[PDB]
Design an enzyme around this catalytic site. Structure first.
Site, PDB file in Angstrom:
ATOM      1  N   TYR A  19       4.163  12.893   7.106  1.00  0.00           N
ATOM      2  CA  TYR A  19       4.530  11.505   6.839  1.00  0.00           C
ATOM      3  C   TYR A  19       6.041  11.286   6.712  1.00  0.00           C
ATOM      4  O   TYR A  19       6.553  10.248   7.124  1.00  0.00           O
ATOM      5  CB  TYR A  19       3.826  11.015   5.574  1.00  0.00           C
ATOM      6  CG  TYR A  19       2.346  10.740   5.759  1.00  0.00           C
ATOM      7  CD1 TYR A  19       1.833  10.361   6.995  1.00  0.00           C
ATOM      8  CD2 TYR A  19       1.465  10.853   4.692  1.00  0.00           C
ATOM      9  CE1 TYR A  19       0.480  10.105   7.159  1.00  0.00           C
ATOM     10  CE2 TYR A  19       0.116  10.601   4.848  1.00  0.00           C
ATOM     11  CZ  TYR A  19      -0.372  10.228   6.082  1.00  0.00           C
ATOM     12  OH  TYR A  19      -1.716   9.978   6.233  1.00  0.00           O
ATOM     13  N   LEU A  38      13.452 -13.734  15.350  1.00  0.00           N
ATOM     14  CA  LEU A  38      12.029 -13.432  15.158  1.00  0.00           C
ATOM     15  C   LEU A  38      11.112 -14.532  15.700  1.00  0.00           C
ATOM     16  O   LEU A  38      10.006 -14.269  16.213  1.00  0.00           O
ATOM     17  CB  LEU A  38      11.745 -13.205  13.675  1.00  0.00           C
ATOM     18  CG  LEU A  38      12.581 -12.113  13.008  1.00  0.00           C
ATOM     19  CD1 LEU A  38      12.256 -12.032  11.527  1.00  0.00           C
ATOM     20  CD2 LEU A  38      12.353 -10.770  13.688  1.00  0.00           C
ATOM     21  N   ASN A  92       7.609   8.782   9.440  1.00  0.00           N
ATOM     22  CA  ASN A  92       8.111   7.527   8.902  1.00  0.00           C
ATOM     23  C   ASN A  92       9.538   7.251   9.344  1.00  0.00           C
ATOM     24  O   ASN A  92       9.866   6.108   9.683  1.00  0.00           O
ATOM     25  CB  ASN A  92       8.024   7.512   7.377  1.00  0.00           C
ATOM     26  CG  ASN A  92       6.609   7.290   6.878  1.00  0.00           C
ATOM     27  OD1 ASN A  92       5.787   6.676   7.561  1.00  0.00           O
ATOM     28  ND2 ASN A  92       6.317   7.790   5.684  1.00  0.00           N
ATOM     29  N   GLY A 147       0.816  -1.212   0.000  1.00  0.00           N
ATOM     30  CA  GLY A 147       0.000   0.000   0.000  1.00  0.00           C
ATOM     31  C   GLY A 147       0.845   1.255   0.000  1.00  0.00           C
ATOM     32  O   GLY A 147       2.041   1.163   0.212  1.00  0.00           O
ATOM     33  N   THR A 176      -8.543   9.780   7.629  1.00  0.00           N
ATOM     34  CA  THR A 176      -8.370  10.348   6.307  1.00  0.00           C
ATOM     35  C   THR A 176      -9.475   9.789   5.428  1.00  0.00           C
ATOM     36  O   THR A 176     -10.103  10.528   4.685  1.00  0.00           O
ATOM     37  CB  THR A 176      -6.974  10.072   5.735  1.00  0.00           C
ATOM     38  OG1 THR A 176      -6.758   8.662   5.636  1.00  0.00           O
ATOM     39  CG2 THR A 176      -5.912  10.683   6.646  1.00  0.00           C
ATOM     40  N   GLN A 224       5.744   3.874   1.425  1.00  0.00           N
ATOM     41  CA  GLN A 224       6.372   5.081   1.976  1.00  0.00           C
ATOM     42  C   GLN A 224       7.340   4.741   3.116  1.00  0.00           C
ATOM     43  O   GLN A 224       8.550   5.120   3.121  1.00  0.00           O
ATOM     44  CB  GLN A 224       5.299   6.056   2.483  1.00  0.00           C
ATOM     45  CG  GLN A 224       4.475   6.747   1.401  1.00  0.00           C
ATOM     46  CD  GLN A 224       5.300   7.688   0.548  1.00  0.00           C
ATOM     47  OE1 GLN A 224       6.336   8.189   0.981  1.00  0.00           O
ATOM     48  NE2 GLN A 224       4.845   7.928  -0.676  1.00  0.00           N
ATOM     49  N   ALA A 250      -7.463  -0.276  -5.474  1.00  0.00           N
ATOM     50  CA  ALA A 250      -8.675  -0.857  -4.941  1.00  0.00           C
ATOM     51  C   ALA A 250      -9.620   0.240  -4.489  1.00  0.00           C
ATOM     52  O   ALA A 250     -10.769  -0.029  -4.152  1.00  0.00           O
ATOM     53  CB  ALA A 250      -8.345  -1.797  -3.794  1.00  0.00           C
ATOM     54  N   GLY A 296      -3.305  -1.709   0.767  1.00  0.00           N
ATOM     55  CA  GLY A 296      -2.860  -2.236   2.048  1.00  0.00           C
ATOM     56  C   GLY A 296      -3.776  -3.292   2.657  1.00  0.00           C
ATOM     57  O   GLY A 296      -3.336  -4.380   3.061  1.00  0.00           O
ATOM     58  N   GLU A 337      11.711 -16.233  18.316  1.00  0.00           N
ATOM     59  CA  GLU A 337      11.602 -15.864  19.730  1.00  0.00           C
ATOM     60  C   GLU A 337      10.485 -14.859  19.943  1.00  0.00           C
ATOM     61  O   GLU A 337       9.626 -15.064  20.798  1.00  0.00           O
ATOM     62  CB  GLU A 337      12.904 -15.261  20.271  1.00  0.00           C
ATOM     63  CG  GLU A 337      14.102 -16.188  20.312  1.00  0.00           C
ATOM     64  CD  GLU A 337      15.327 -15.526  20.928  1.00  0.00           C
ATOM     65  OE1 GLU A 337      15.196 -14.892  21.997  1.00  0.00           O
ATOM     66  OE2 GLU A 337      16.423 -15.638  20.339  1.00  0.00           O
TER      67      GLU A 337
HETATM   68  N1  LIG Z   1       2.582   6.499   8.840  1.00  0.00           N
HETATM   69  C1  LIG Z   1       2.137   6.771   7.622  1.00  0.00           C
HETATM   70  N2  LIG Z   1       0.819   6.536   7.322  1.00  0.00           N
HETATM   71  C2  LIG Z   1       0.366   6.811   6.080  1.00  0.00           C
HETATM   72  C3  LIG Z   1       1.203   7.326   5.097  1.00  0.00           C
HETATM   73  N3  LIG Z   1       0.465   7.492   3.976  1.00  0.00           N
HETATM   74  C4  LIG Z   1      -0.804   7.094   4.232  1.00  0.00           C
HETATM   75  N4  LIG Z   1      -0.878   6.682   5.536  1.00  0.00           N
HETATM   76  C5  LIG Z   1      -2.052   6.148   6.241  1.00  0.00           C
HETATM   77  O1  LIG Z   1      -2.596   5.113   5.447  1.00  0.00           O
HETATM   78  C6  LIG Z   1      -4.007   5.174   5.437  1.00  0.00           C
HETATM   79  C7  LIG Z   1      -4.455   5.380   3.993  1.00  0.00           C
HETATM   80  O2  LIG Z   1      -4.087   4.254   3.222  1.00  0.00           O
HETATM   81  P1  LIG Z   1      -3.000   4.281   2.028  1.00  0.00           P
HETATM   82  O3  LIG Z   1      -1.811   3.406   2.356  1.00  0.00           O
HETATM   83  O4  LIG Z   1      -2.568   5.697   1.723  1.00  0.00           O
HETATM   84  O5  LIG Z   1      -3.853   3.734   0.773  1.00  0.00           O
HETATM   85  P2  LIG Z   1      -3.493   2.432  -0.106  1.00  0.00           P
HETATM   86  O6  LIG Z   1      -2.879   1.340   0.740  1.00  0.00           O
HETATM   87  O7  LIG Z   1      -2.581   2.801  -1.252  1.00  0.00           O
HETATM   88  O8  LIG Z   1      -4.918   1.883  -0.628  1.00  0.00           O
HETATM   89  P3  LIG Z   1      -5.891   2.466  -1.778  1.00  0.00           P
HETATM   90  O9  LIG Z   1      -5.346   3.707  -2.444  1.00  0.00           O
HETATM   91  O10 LIG Z   1      -7.240   2.766  -1.165  1.00  0.00           O
HETATM   92  O11 LIG Z   1      -6.067   1.370  -2.801  1.00  0.00           O
HETATM   93  C8  LIG Z   1      -4.405   6.321   6.349  1.00  0.00           C
HETATM   94  O12 LIG Z   1      -4.668   5.802   7.633  1.00  0.00           O
HETATM   95  C9  LIG Z   1      -3.159   7.177   6.392  1.00  0.00           C
HETATM   96  O13 LIG Z   1      -3.040   7.885   7.603  1.00  0.00           O
HETATM   97  C10 LIG Z   1       2.541   7.562   5.396  1.00  0.00           C
HETATM   98  O14 LIG Z   1       3.314   8.020   4.554  1.00  0.00           O
HETATM   99  N5  LIG Z   1       2.995   7.281   6.668  1.00  0.00           N
END
Ligand SMILES: Nc1nc2c(ncn2[C@@H]2O[C@H](COP(=O)(O)OP(=O)(O)OP(=O)(O)O)[C@@H](O)[C@H]2O)c(=O)[nH]1
Ligand SMILES: C=C1C[C@@H]2CCCC(=O)C/C(C)=C\C=C\C(=O)O[C@H]([C@H](O)NC(=O)/C=C\C=C\C)C/C(C)=C/[C@H](C1)O2
Ligand SMILES: C=C1C[C@@H]2CCCC(=O)C/C(C)=C\C=C\C(=O)O[C@H]([C@H](O)NC(=O)/C=C\C=C\C)C/C(C)=C/[C@H](C1)O2
Ligand SMILES: Nc1nc2c(ncn2[C@@H]2O[C@H](COP(=O)(O)OP(=O)(O)OP(=O)(O)O)[C@@H](O)[C@H]2O)c(=O)[nH]1
Ligand SMILES: Nc1nc2c(ncn2[C@@H]2O[C@H](COP(=O)(O)OP(=O)(O)O)[C@@H](O)[C@H]2O)c(=O)[nH]1
Ligand SMILES: Nc1nc2c(ncn2[C@@H]2O[C@H](COP(=O)(O)OP(=O)(O)O)[C@@H](O)[C@H]2O)c(=O)[nH]1
Ligand SMILES: [Mg+2]
Ligand SMILES: [Mg+2]
EC number: 3.6.5.-
Lengths: 426, 426, 426, 426
Positions: free
Chosen positions: B213, B241, B217, B10, B168, B15, B88, B135, B243
């Site tokens: 982010y 792991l 991150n 995802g 979000t 990221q 998705a 994700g 463990e």
């Molecule tokens: N920690 C962190 N959370 C993130 C970041 N980008 C998005 N999120 C979190 O991820 C969630 C959104 O899902 P995403 O990962 O952006 O979307 P995706 O997995 O690409 O799924 P779809 O676009 O819907 O197909 C929210 O809860 C955001 O706060 C990031 O760079 N760092």
């Protein structure tokens, strides 16, 4: 890539689209000849979404112009457009529907439709992953309203899993621009609602307020009004056209903003909105930007957003900013204004951030509300329509084309079911 | 060398991965193109070009495309960077069925290929969020395939907990439930963090104004870095792991530990502080360093782990622990008498160039299972319940083939699991 | 090293603290950034950056903000410098309830943290005035919390006595009563000084034209310096703070000693003077060196202490004392037969650079409890009574939740305590 | 920080505020464009109190301009102001109330009020800790008097725990500037007294004396008179805007100067006051400065301060000076003049010192008296009002707007209770 395709219908549709496609051409560094000249890689990184490269730098807007009244496009291609657009795409007849829905859609428009669809197929064949169709329209202008509706029915049949959406100008609640504008609207809506995934609702009146009073614009012409519309359209697509912390694709935005099937009616918001004189007195923060987004004055549809509740709100931001700053600020807003959000959805906010700003505005954002408030606009049309319908005002132009009284009956009945659903959720 | 698999799923997963592998390269002195114990995550190829054990899956090509343009493009394998066509759109039905199908085979064949590149395959981490379509749905599909093909190997997943107040996506509560329910039977331990609590911590401790982010991150990546450090480096008490699974999972299904890290402090504050082993350990059990916004005083500790990094000696630890256990304000479950496994690693933590954390001689990752997590459960169970009571956005899955009552059963399972937290605490 | 806590409350407490810690750094050779027995007030950190045991609390951020900009910014801990938003505005109801609540928890957690930095925690000094809102209400709240969390530790407070004729705030009499009443049950010994008597002394002895808070504070800081010197340095008779309590408190509640210091003289006068042990000791019992404007001949001494600094030998002291006791013009109470504990410290007193006192080889801090203090009581009891008879400014507390008759009872307690002075003298 | 917000109402209000905001801009080194150019750190250290930074150096005065008569502000923004002030804050109609309280407050003013309050909220949202509201007014000018009163009622409802205060020009006891000035005053006062924390009372007549005779000013225009008013306002806030030996926040000053609820009426004093010719013959000492402060000639309200007794006197000093010098001098004054101080309050003095002088005056101070003398001004209005009220002079302009006779009856009745309270304490 994922390509989106546009249709433009009506004077309204073709005029709005005129500047819209101008704007995007700016957004990607494309000159008036269709030749890409931008500097940054992101200028053309995703250019494929809206452009088909026809050689060298020739970039072809993925769009079809459709109008039964030939002078419209004639003026468009007389302007700084005609050589961007390819002449395969000018699909036009020589007869006006003269603001008869019955004509533009149901009778003569159909002739043109066939040739249109063929061009549609051309584009859909050349596309890699067809992500859908944006169609400019006036909800009350005869061929914008009608002809668009027919095209939509057909295209949705042939691409039923694609995102299809329209930008339909809703009739200004105070002033009517067509005497039968309520007819053109109610009919269009009947078929528009069932055959589209999204429809944007916008009023020239609200735009006037925004132009003249908020932006202190001295003479609000259509070039400047359409500048505003072009605006909100551009932002949505930045979700696809550019990367960002939260990339939220158009489909994803759609999914998040439609709680229930058929209530896909949107009132684009806008930020920042202040005239050049006042810009030195403020700072574009996320708090500022959001305060702008949460203003009834910055609501581009003529509807007071504090009537009823927000079902869902998509805050799409452009430019760099902190996720805490944004998140927190949006939540501050939701907490303070909690009387305006539907209890159904915990976390009534929704957000996305693309890491590129528009135009030279460091911060920008566009606000897509879906409030039960919007029902008032539906009332506007319903009420006006109803009165005329009783007396059969201007009936013989539509029934002249063969339109049934029950067609209008069912059309209003479905707008009444529509508003009824808004109430149930309000 | 025992080596582990990493998967990133995802936007979130990818990221985080970006930063994660940048960090790893920095921890081994590896250049962005792979140019030279790291063979536990890298495969040395003919030229000293170490290539990472990681597969990146993105249905929304934009994110990995950026990675593919980014500096660490060189490092990764084009066959590792697996991009789709469309995402998705925050729909589990597509991530785990409709769209996920397509790639899921492609990815598995990478995984099997990479598994034959390996001798000592030990675990495999999966980065994603709980609600992002990619994700969410995709992960549970993948995990089910890996629980077949490997099954014995450690299944590690990082799913960011949907921050309590701050969301979000609107349908994020849906996705979490559904994702989680599924992956419950295929995952050995699942980690959750809160973006909000982390924001609070960035501000509080590091003295950050507005988190995003990027820097967030970098924090997460260092937490993971310590976990792996037990594998990647010499330490007195080296933890495998396998463990981690044995000790962090008190009970077949409640494998949902949360983890924090100390010292989280600005370089400035480090001079008004002497960070001893005991100092830091104390800080690890401060509710304000609590990286999921769930105050530990709301429940009792089911389990513990101290992954110590840098200059930390066995007795100082033992004494620090003695102090902690002495503090009876840390309530832990009768069920679990003395279980405080401590890990200790030797290798110090490392700081990212352009980073925001104080370079400290010693650090620790605290990890725990507390009954207080049931609070987090409650939230989402309810959030989901609310919208499911409406069928807000139900048309959207149920068109995709998802079953009413499937959703009910999934939430039932989440409620049973919450009821199981209660059971342990007793 | 036995180490002590210091707290500074209010503008007064903070100002005095400013000078106090500047002095301490000078007494140990410590640079303004903490750069190197002082470990009895300092914590040596990794770099030789000794950091003070002191917490600064200011609801009116301006004062500490100045400290935070000031040169000794470097020295203190950002977590030590605890600032609020707005001050109590000379209102005990806010200092001890409404506003004080907010921070009081934050501060306590600093204190507990710092108490774990320590092994040998012995006392804790609290600098404030008797009437400043911050100083007044806040202190009594704090002391009550420290009497819980520590309770065994020495509770020392410095509250500047509201100079008999000279006041800055109108309601200052209120605040003192109320503050005092409360803190009576939580404080082990409270010191009082008079800004007026001190002004008189600056002029008289030091030959100062016009005193202000700057130089006045330098004086006070040296008095405190001697007290601590018994802890911080080698002396023949080293006095611990626990001792101070044992010997200066004849009676559970009358712990309200006053203290002076000699030699107070300009560098000029030092050459027309030979300051012997006996010379100075004599000067200590001169009513003109009396740092509270309360002439010692108005009552009898309940107790005594001589903190001798520098070149002072046991016999010279013993002989000087013999001389003093011989002078029967110093009347002391039948109740307390020979109680003249003398402290003696070895370490000399020190002079502030740019200071106004003569660098002397020997000095002494005299401290005493006299029945004459009842005079000071009388004053404030009455002052308060007068305004309370009016309810001048009563609306102002009673709106804040304060009780009529609470104020009456508080003053009752002060009158009972004054009546207790009478009781001792008998 | 603690932000104060201003309102300006009336010609009088907007004119006075014109120079006031000019003056403060000087005080902080702010140029006429709103861009900060000062040199010292203290120039902008606390700038946040009165300024909101809108970018770079744009500093925005925290103030709202309110007038029903548009030419007023038009002249203000024609002057060296208009580009400091932001156009969001110009809230004005086009209709004069024509010195009808009934209009400016009760009827038409209300229209404007709504938009005003919205801007108020904007500012109060942008503020960190809202410390209140200063409102310039003429007590007898129709829209200064009235409109201000309405704004105050509303704002106090929405921020009831904030310090709200007004600078209302009291009608000159000799000459009336409006024939109905007694009506406008008495009405305003009715609501002003109950809805404000502080009101300053000032007369143009007294100012004339001060200008022409004490300062030997040849032609006393409003620019120079307002120079004097601007003066005393500036000083008060130095308590907040700058540090000092005794920092006495505006709230603290308020608390100390109000012995009883409702008697918050102040007659600003001034020092030094002497024309440039005579300045070479004197020395600005604290004795000099205080002698100036204790002069009936330097009383800016037209009232002989030696009629009756001082309830409370706040001497706020600016610039460096000794605390003994000040204290002693103030006490010398209180001793000598003890026949003019209320026996109720022991230590009738009150003092504060900020360590920065105004403008280039080494020493300066501002004197805030509250003497029972002030009752005479209330008589002035009462008496004049009464006579007109008997005959119903000019009644039909107010009753024309719908004002009740009993409204005026109760208004005077409450001024009579007010003066009655002054007597009781005299
Ligand atoms: N920690 C962190 N959370 C993130 C970041 N980008 C998005 N999120 C979190 O991820 C969630 C959104 O899902 P995403 O990962 O952006 O979307 P995706 O997995 O690409 O799924 P779809 O676009 O819907 O197909 C929210 O809860 C955001 O706060 C990031 O760079 N760092
Ligand atoms: C999607 C877009 C692109 C269009 C681009 C059209 C530009 C055009 O040709 C005219 C021009 C160069 C600038 C117009 C700015 C504009 O109307 O400016 C607008 C408004 O007046 N700006 C603000 O209110 C800005 C700051 C407010 C602070 C309180 C908003 C506006 C509709 C911007 C849109 C955003 O501009
Ligand atoms: C709050 C403030 C700021 C204003 C600033 C306005 C300055 C202005 O534009 C004109 C000017 C440059 C100086 C005016 C001095 C003034 O009136 O001077 C005044 C008077 O004439 N000065 C004295 O009487 C000084 C010494 C007296 C000794 C006995 C007092 C005065 C009203 C000062 C105020 C204080 O000046
Ligand atoms: N010795 C000494 N006394 C001071 C100093 N500053 C203020 N005071 C005394 O303290 C009293 C006023 O209280 P402050 O400490 O200034 O006020 P505060 O504690 O900040 O409380 P509030 O502002 O009312 O909330 C008066 O008796 C002053 O004489 C100083 O620097 N030195
Ligand atoms: N925003 C916008 N609206 C327009 C423009 N031109 C016409 N309209 C609106 O469109 C409606 C008239 O429809 P029109 O497009 O002219 O009719 P058509 O040619 O038959 O499709 C009226 O409500 C107008 O307010 C334009 O340039 N911009
Ligand atoms: N100090 C001062 N007083 C003024 C000024 N202009 C008018 N006044 C006084 O204000 C009163 C007239 O009120 P005004 O503000 O003109 O009426 P409004 O416009 O209806 O609020 C009279 O008592 C004048 O003496 C000025 O510039 N300075
Ligand atoms: Mg994504
Ligand atoms: Mg203070």
């Amino acid at each position: 890539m994922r390509e989106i395709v546009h249709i433009q219908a009506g004077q309204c549709g073709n005029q709005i689209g005129a500047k819209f496609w101008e704007v995007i051409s700016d957004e990607h560094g494309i000159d008036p000849t269709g030749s890409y000249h931008g500097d940054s890689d992101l200028q053309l990184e995703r250019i494929n979404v809206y452009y088909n490269e026809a050689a060298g730098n020739k970039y072809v807007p993925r769009a079809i112009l459709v109008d039964l009244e030939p002078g419209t496009m004639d003026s468009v291609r007389s302007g700084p457009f005609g050589q961007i657009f390819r002449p395969d795409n000018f699909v036009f007849g020589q007869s006006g529907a003269g603001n008869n829905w019955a004509k533009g859609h149901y009778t003569e428009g159909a002739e043109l439709v066939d040739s249109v669809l063929d061009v549609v197929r051309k584009e859909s064949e050349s596309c890699d992953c067809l992500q859908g169709f944006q169609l400019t329209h006036s909800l009350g202008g005869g061929t914008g309203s009608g002809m668009g509706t027919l095209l939509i029915s057909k295209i949705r049949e042939e691409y039923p899993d694609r995102i299809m959406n329209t930008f339909s100008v809703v009739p200004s609640p105070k002033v009517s621009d067509t005497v039968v504008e309520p007819y053109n609207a109610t009919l269009s809506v009947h078929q528009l609602v069932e055959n589209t995934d999204e429809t944007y609702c916008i009023d020239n009146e609200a735009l006037y307020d925004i132009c003249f009073r908020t932006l202190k614009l001295t003479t609000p012409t259509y070039g400047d009004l359409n500048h505003l519309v072009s605006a909100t359209m551009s932002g949505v697509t930045t979700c696809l056209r550019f990367p960002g912390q939260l990339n939220a694709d158009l489909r994803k935005l759609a999914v998040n903003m439609v709680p229930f099937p058929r209530l896909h009616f949107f009132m684009p918001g806008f930020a920042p909105l202040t005239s050049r004189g006042s810009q030195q007195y403020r700072a574009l923060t996320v708090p500022e930007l959001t305060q702008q987004m949460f203003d009834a004055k910055n609501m581009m549809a003529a509807c007071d957003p504090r009537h009823g509740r927000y079902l869902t709100v998509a805050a799409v931001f452009r430019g760099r900013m902190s996720m805490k700053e944004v998140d927190e600020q949006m939540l501050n807003v939701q907490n303070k204004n909690s009387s305006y959000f539907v209890e159904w959805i915990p976390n009534n906010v929704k957000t996305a951030v693309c890491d590129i700003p528009p135009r030279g505005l460091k911060m920008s954002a566009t606000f897509i509300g879906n409030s039960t408030a919007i029902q008032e606009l539906f009332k506007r049309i319903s009420e006006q329509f109803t009165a005329m319908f009783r007396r059969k005002a201007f009936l013989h132009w539509y029934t002249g084309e063969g339109m049934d009284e029950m067609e209008f009956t069912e059309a209003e009945s479905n707008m009444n079911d529509l508003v009824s659903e808004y109430q149930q959720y309000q | 060398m025992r080596e582990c698999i990493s998967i990133h799923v995802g936007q979130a997963g990818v990221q985080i991965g970006n930063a994660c592998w940048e960090l790893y390269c920095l921890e081994h002195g590896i250049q962005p193109d792979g140019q030279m114990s790291f063979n536990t995550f890298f495969s040395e190829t003919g030229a000293g070009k170490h290539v990472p054990r990681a597969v990146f899956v993105d249905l929304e090509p934009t994110v990995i495309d950026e990675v593919r343009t980014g500096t660490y493009r060189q490092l990764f394998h084009p066959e590792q960077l697996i991009t789709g066509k469309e995402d998705a759109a925050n729909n589990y039905a597509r991530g785990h069925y409709t769209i996920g199908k397509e790639i899921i085979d492609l990815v598995l064949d990478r995984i099997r290929k990479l598994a034959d590149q390996c001798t000592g395959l030990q675990g495999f981490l999966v980065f994603h969020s709980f609600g992002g379509g990619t994700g969410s749905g995709f992960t549970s599909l993948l995990m089910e395939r890996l629980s077949v093909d490997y099954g014995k190997k450690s299944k590690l997943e990082f799913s960011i907990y949907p921050a309590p107040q701050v969301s979000t996506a609107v349908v994020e509560p849906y996705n979490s439930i559904l994702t989680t329910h599924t992956t419950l039977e295929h995952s050995d331990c699942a980690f959750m963090v809160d973006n909000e609590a982390i924001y609070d911590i960035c501000r509080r401790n590091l003295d950050i104004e507005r988190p995003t982010y990027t820097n967030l991150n970098r924090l997460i990546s260092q937490i993971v870095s310590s976990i792996t450090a037990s594998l990647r480096f010499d330490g007195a008490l080296n933890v495998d792991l396998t463990e981690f699974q044995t000790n962090l999972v008190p009970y077949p299904r409640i494998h949902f530990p949360l983890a924090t890290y100390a010292p989280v402090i600005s370089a400035e504050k480090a001079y008004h502080e002497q960070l001893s082993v005991a100092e830091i350990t104390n800080a690890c059990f401060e509710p304000a360093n609590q990286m999921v916004k769930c105050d530990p005083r709301h429940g009792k500790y089911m389990a513990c782990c101290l992954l110590y990094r840098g200059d930390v000696v066995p007795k100082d630890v033992n004494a620090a622990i003695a102090t902690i256990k002495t503090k009876r304000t840390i309530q832990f479950v009768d069920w679990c008498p003395t279980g405080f496994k401590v890990g200790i690693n030797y290798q110090p933590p490392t700081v990212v160039p352009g980073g925001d954390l104080a370079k400290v001689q010693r650090a620790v990752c605290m990890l725990s299972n507390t009954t207080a997590i049931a609070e987090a459960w409650a939230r989402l169970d309810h959030k989901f319940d609310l919208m499911y009571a409406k069928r807000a956005f139900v048309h959207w899955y149920v068109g995709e083939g998802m079953e009413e009552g499937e959703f009910s059963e999934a939430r039932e399972d989440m409620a049973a699991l919450e009821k199981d937290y209660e059971e342990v605490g007793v």
